[PDB]
Each structure stands twice: as C-alpha cells, then as structure tokens.
Amino acid sequence: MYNFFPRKPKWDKNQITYRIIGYTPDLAPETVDDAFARAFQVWSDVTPLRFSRIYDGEADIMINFGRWEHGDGYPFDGKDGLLAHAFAPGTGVGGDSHFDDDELWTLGKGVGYSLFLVAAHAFGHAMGLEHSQDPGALMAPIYTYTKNFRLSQDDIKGIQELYGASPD
C-alpha cells in the first residue's frame, strides 16, 4: 500500500511555489511548463495543496535537468536506471526535483519517458510519499506508460493522510 518517509515529513503550508532553473532541449519549453503544471495538478485535485510557478528567486520546489554529478552528492547514472529524483519536504534542497537529461523526455508516447508521469511521481516524493507496491500506482518504483493516466486509490489515500482532501 502507500508509504511515507520514516519521519512523516510534510509541508506546513498549502500554498507552494516552484521554479524551473533549466529546461530539457528534448521538449518545447511550453510543453515542459504544461507537463510540470499538470503533474502538480494531479496532486492538487485531491488535496488543498496549491502549486504556483515563479521565474526568479528561491522556490520551494527548484526544478532542474542534469546528468551524472549535478551537484548534490546523488549522481545520475546515464541512460536508463534512475529517471529522476526528489527530496522529501523541507528547507533548501528539500522538495527540489531533478531529472536525468541522459534520458529522452517525451509527452503522450510509448517511446522515451513521459515528463508528465515522471514529474508527477517525483513530485509525489517532494510531497512526502514513498513508493507503493501497487503496480497501477503512480508511486510504483517501476516506470509504465499509459495513454490515459489516473490516480489509483492508493495514491489518493496516502496523500490525503498527509494533507487532507480537497476543500473545493
């Protein structure tokens, strides 16, 4: 079933900002923006957590692409393997989300890796969720493409445990 980080870290507010430090050449900037927005939105739809993009300064979730040693002591590994990683909620590096640009990032396709689905997963971690054993969970540790994505009940119950259900 659903899991958290051992110390159950969570955000203390409902309004969270993000910033994209760098883009991937693999996709149009537009496409990337909306990929990340949609990824955040799938968590917004079942919690009171609200995600706002900024273009400057320190955000809660600083997003970048990078490969191998990219300056945080947890290197990436080239093509395949680790797709991306995210830090559990917190100050500084906490919450931040990095993506392996040795991968080919795509949208709506069985080739490459859907930036939408991987962001949505990585951001899940950035919220405090650990992996699920459920094969049809977004928080499964193994990639799967699906043309029509939904949140599994397992993903919804874990996140609602931490931050509660949508008020709207």
Binding site: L83, A84, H85, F87
Partner: peptide, 6 residues
C-alpha cells in the same frame, strides 16, 4: 533510489 533525504 529516487526519494532522498536533507
């Protein structure tokens, strides 16, 4: 190992 700690 995609969910890190700190």
């Amino acid at each position: 190992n995609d969910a890190l700690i700190x």
